[PDB]
Amino acid sequence: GIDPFTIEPAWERHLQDVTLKEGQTCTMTCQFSVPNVKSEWFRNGRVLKPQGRVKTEVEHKVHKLTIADVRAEDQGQYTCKHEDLETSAELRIEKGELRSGC
């Protein structure tokens, strides 16, 4: 028969929409079927570069975006794209005092 034991690129777990308060470290993850491959990150359409708060990590299949001490400006629907295949999630900073304090 077929039995595809080989793993063709797939966005099996799409980027997840994270909502948090400022100052927290973010980690937006997504599962790209291919082991140890890199991808281009986009924040609101813009190519994301791991500068300052941002760190671009990659696991076996899952790709992660680490953002230490996030701000409301660190939002911007993140898209993890590997050439052809892409995924996206809206990053949301909630925020302030009401329902976002202690």
**DSSP class per residue in 43-102:** ETTEEP---TTEEEEE-SSEEEEEETT--GGG-S-EEEEETTEEEEE--EE--SSTTS--
Q: Is residue 3 part of a domain?
A: no
Q: Is residue 35 part of a domain?
A: yes
Beta carbons of 69 and 21 less than 8 angstroms apart:
no
DSSP run (H or E) holding 7: none
Provide the 10 A C-beta neighbour count for residue 44.
Answer: 12
Q: How many Å separate Cα 67 from the centre of its chain?
A: 10
Taking a C-beta distance cutoff of 8 angstroms, is the pair 44, 89 a contact? Answer: no
Domain total for the chain? 1
Which domain does 33 fall in, by range?
Answer: 11-93
> By what method was this entry solved?
NMR
With respect to residue 98, please indicate whether it lies within any of the assigned structural domains: no
Q: Is residue 48 part of a domain?
A: yes
Backbone torsions φ then ψ of 74, nearest 5 degrees: -85, 5
What amino acid occupies position 16? Answer: Q
CATH of the domain at 31: 2.60.40.10
Contact between 67 and 25 (Cβ < 8 Å)? yes
Beta-bridge mates of residue 13: 31
Does residue 86 belong to any structural domain of this protein? yes
